[PDB]
Design a protein around this ligand. Structure first.
Ligand SMILES: C/C(=C\C(=O)O)C(=O)O
Ligand SMILES: [Cl-]
Ligand SMILES: [Mg+2]
Ligand SMILES: [Mg+2]
Length: 307
């Protein structure tokens, strides 16, 4: 009789990899478990936004989240590895890293704080945007970039002699519109779904980092479920993860196409030489975090680039 409630809060639009994943998890759970588990999905920060969502998870005011891997520094300093620029060539590489023993272990890295990782969901690679062309690294100097609340990402832009402003995802469009910030970094999906292309005249397809998610829950809640239900929820989560990874690839592509079709933002692609120039300018930031992430994680992550 007593329905089990899973409030699943996230900050993105519905027509995105995570937005679709949350909705699919709801659909499959409600259909397969016959209503014993209810999943209430809250997109676009409608329940909780960045930062506040984690506070809520610890207090039991929400049961499921899927934050960007860049937003966990207050819970563990190991997951920061995912934010290092140019560490992963593409999503295939980060996937290999995530499936390694160390990558699997990161799902438990916050267990001591009451947070359990259930899955990794892909979004895509990060691009650069601004209201001026970003062709070479010197072009970023003196600009104000919005970043996720991440020490690594702050330092990434400081390394370029740019200014970083940590701001919640909900506030990016207005920040750029009103000039609080000049540029940012994100996946095509996030840019187009929030209409940020309307307030950014230039994009550079840098693929200089990535956005992936860790699906997380409150340990007390998850462990308090009947074992048969918990195990089935995890199997369903595994099926949803497969679907999300598919949605991510095509949704990012479609978003890029929509931005290009507007004919009101330009997209600059880089030659290998041009991308290497950006890499040379940004890679020194790794020095500031190699202690936190550790030699082993770095080695494993770099090795993921070799099939
Ligand atoms: C990557 C971000 C959000 C998200 O959840 O996709 C962000 O830029 O805040
Ligand atoms: Cl937000
Ligand atoms: Mg219902
Ligand atoms: Mg909004």
């Amino acid at each position: 009789a007593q329905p089990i409630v899973i409030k699943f809060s996230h900050v993105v639009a519905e027509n995105t990899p995570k937005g679709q994943g949350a909705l699919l998890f709801k659909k499959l759970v409600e259909q397969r478990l016959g209503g014993r588990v209810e999943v209430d999905v809250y997109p676009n920060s409608s329940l909780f936004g960045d930062g506040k969502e984690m506070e809520a998870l610890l207090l039991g005011d929400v049961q499921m989240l899927a934050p960007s891997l860049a937003k966990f520094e207050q819970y563990t300093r190991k997951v920061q590895i995912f934010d290092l620029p140019f560490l992963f060539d593409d999503i295939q590489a980060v996937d290999r890293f995530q499936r390694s023993p160390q990558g699997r272990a990161l799902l438990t890295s916050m267990q001591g704080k009451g947070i359990l990782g259930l899955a990794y969901w892909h979004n895509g690679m990060k691009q650069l945007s601004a209201n001026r062309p970003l062709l070479e690294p010197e072009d970023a100097r003196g600009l104000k970039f919005r970043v996720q609340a991440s020490d690594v990402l702050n330092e990434q832009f400081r390394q370029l002699r740019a200014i970083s402003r940590k701001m919640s995802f909900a506030e990016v469009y207005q920040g750029l519109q009103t000039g609080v910030v000049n540029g940012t970094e994100n996946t095509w999906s996030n840019y187009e779904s929030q209409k940020v292309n309307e307030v950014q005249k230039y994009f550079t397809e840098s693929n200089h980092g990535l956005v992936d998610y860790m699906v997380i829950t409150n340990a007390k809640f998850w462990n308090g479920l009947p074992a048969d239900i918990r195990e089935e929820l995890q199997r369903i989560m595994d099926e949803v993860t497969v679907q999300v990874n598919l949605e991510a690839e095509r949704l990012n592509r479609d978003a890029r196409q929509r931005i290009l079709a507007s004919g009101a933002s330009e997209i600059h692609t880089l030659s290998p030489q041009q991308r290497a120039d950006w890499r040379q300018a940004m890679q020194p930031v790794w020095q500031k975090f190699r202690g936190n992430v550790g030699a082993d994680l770095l080695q494993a992550a770099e090795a993921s680039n070799r099939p």
